[PDB]
């Protein structure tokens, strides 16, 4: 009875519960519980155990040490339809029964700011669901099995973990980590691997196009070729710093055909006007094509290469599918067709020259914290 639904989240907060000024927080499936048949997912309602015969005392002690007992699950079986909330609150509740401690138990039922390894469910936790006592991220701790350790990081343990959202959502919010093993078993630190991409690096700072000797705009016509990922932020730089200044944007998720897009050059460059090509442009013979109309006009042409990795325009895609309810996803499929066709833009296809355009941080502190969490498992 004491569970609150939220939107895309649900909270539990036991007969007991203190507020407290730090925490040792947990996932569910996998670090307190397991199935008892062996399945990655429990055959019914009453599938479950608690994972060791350890955790209990465990809990217990921190209970006494003045911890306050969370859990951080991601259930977004729930928000896909797969499992009814009603049904995993029930579960919850008759785990939390056997484990004989007060916890408070957030669940991330859908994608996005909640589900880990965004911190979502930290800062409700934090902001919202302690009685606004601050707490200690450095005194507190987290616990779980998704720690993308290596396959074979123990006997039996032949395939590595399925994911590395539990040690993320650590890394994300500064938590001291630990798996459940580590955790209760004092095993030893076993070897893990995280994403290469870490939206840690992601600089606001830094020059907006290289080199920086050179320049953005030219006062005479030209055509700019773009190339870039999808999801790269390609359109949002071209309106925010060409289109702006007076060019013509061509783009073809607009237009529909690469015949309605190289007329509207050719058009712009009659009308004594500065034209931007606003697509992947994956490779030479796409290209090449908006080189000739800049060829035919007398005008110079120029490269706007977008330096964004797929990892990059891929965490750019869940950034804005998080904040913006309109963007459409641009699906990985897509991304590694890009990838499978590209080829580097050369001095030698005919550019004036080759600006290359980093990928920086796009904007609100709160949102800019959130660009740089790690946001897949
Ligand atoms: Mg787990």
């Not at 062996?38 to 465990?58: A, C, N």
């Not at 840690?200 to 005479?220: D, F, K, M, V, W």
Request: proline fraction near 8%; glycine fraction near 8%; hydrophobic fraction near 40%.
């Amino acid at each position: 009875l004491g569970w609150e639904s939220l939107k895309k989240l649900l909270v539990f907060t036991a007969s007991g519960v203190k507020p407290q000024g730090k925490v040792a927080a947990f996932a569910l499936d996998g670090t307190l519980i397991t199935t008892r048949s062996g399945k990655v997912f429990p055959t019914s309602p009453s599938d479950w155990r608690i994972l060791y015969p350890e955790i209990p005392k465990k809990l217990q002690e921190l209970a006494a040490e003045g911890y306050k007992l969370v859990i951080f699950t991601n259930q977004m079986g729930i928000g896909r339809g797969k499992l009814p909330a009603e049904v995993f609150k029930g579960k919850v509740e008759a785990v939390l029964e056997k484990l004989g401690v007060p916890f408070q138990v957030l669940v991330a039922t859908h994608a996005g700011l909640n589900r880990k390894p965004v911190s979502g469910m930290w800062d409700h936790l934090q902001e919202q669901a302690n009685e606004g006592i601050p707490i200690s991220v450095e005194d507190s701790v987290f616990v779980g099995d998704a720690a993308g350790r290596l396959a074979n990081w123990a006997p039996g343990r032949k395939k590595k973990d399925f994911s590395c959202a539990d040690r993320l959502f650590a890394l994300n919010v500064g938590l001291p980590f630990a798996t459940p093993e580590e955790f209760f078993l004092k095993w030893p630190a076993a070897r893990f691997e995280l994403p290469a991409f870490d939206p840690r690096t992601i600089s606001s700072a830094g020059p907006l196009y290289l080199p920086e000797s050179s320049s953005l705009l030219s006062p005479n016509p030209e055509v700019v070729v773009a190339v870039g990922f999808p999801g790269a932020g390609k359109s949002t730089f071209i309106q925010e710093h060409l289109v702006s200044a007076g060019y013509v944007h061509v783009n073809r998720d607009t237009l529909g055909s690469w015949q309605r897009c190289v007329s509207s050059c050719q058009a712009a460059l009659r009308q004594g006007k500065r034209v931007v090509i606003d697509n992947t442009n994956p490779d030479v013979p796409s290209r090449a094509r908006y080189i000739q109309c800049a060829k035919d006009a007398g005008v110079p042409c120029r490269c706007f290469n977008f330096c964004a990795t797929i990892e990059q325009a891929r965490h750019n895609n869940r950034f804005r599918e998080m904040t913006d309810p309109s963007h459409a996803p641009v699906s990985d499929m897509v991304m590694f067709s890009y990838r499978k066709q590209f080829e580097p833009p050369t001095l030698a296809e005919g550019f004036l020259e080759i600006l290359e355009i980093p990928f920086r941080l796009q904007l609100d502190p709160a949102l800019q914290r959130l660009y740089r969490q790690f946001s897949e498992g």
